[PDB]
Symmetry: C2
Subunit: 119 residues, 2 copies
């Protein structure tokens, strides 16, 4: 079926790939400049962006899930730090100003993945 | 169901919205700092990025469609230029180096939308 997937930057496909495999994602494809991961219907696509600054990055995306808790349980179990400085880190699910519950995830490359709880 | 959606920038929600509406997309949600457009199962999300350079931007995403042809018929019929310079523009479907047929669409902020045929 029709569907739009994001394109996120990676300073090293190996690390990226390694980091997402621990969450349930795997490799659907991997070229020298393009890699695709996937966990269930969640599919993310990366591209090489060597000249990127993880601290000045504005890249992000949403992961609207049916069970944010479970998925957050995993991020913790895989050892992602629950700090408020540096990357990668996670912030527990908090009721957002817009009425939705959303947890934050910052991948190895400073990309922000807004974890939202599907309604 | 669990999905992944892109986070694209928007120098002006009005101009953006206008642009996408012509492609069958319609607003699902609109706030002051966040907009969500939808079309069937496709769903993009936008954010305010006034200090963005449409020429130096690296933002993009994939629209894996069941009928790339028709979707491209819309982009054409609504007047999008098929040039190779300037934005917004489009590039006819070309068999990609990875064995897939993909057409390229660039919106008013220089964001690349890879129109790929679903296998």
């Amino acid at each position: 079926t029709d569907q739009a997937t994001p394109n996120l930057p990676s300073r090293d496909f190996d690390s990226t790939a390694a980091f997402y495999e621990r969450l349930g994602f795997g490799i659907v494809f991997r070229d020298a400049g393009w890699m695709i991961l996937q966990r269930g219907d969640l599919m993310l696509e990366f591209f090489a962006h060597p000249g990127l600054d993880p601290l000045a990055s504005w890249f992000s995306c949403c992961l609207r899930l049916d069970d944010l808790a479970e998925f957050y349980r995993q991020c913790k179990s895989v050892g992602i730090q629950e700090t408020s400085s540096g990357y990668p880190r996670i912030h527990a699910p908090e009721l957002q100003e817009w009425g939705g519950t959303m947890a934050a995830l910052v991948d190895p490359d400073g990309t922000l993945l807004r974890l939202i709880q599907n309604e």
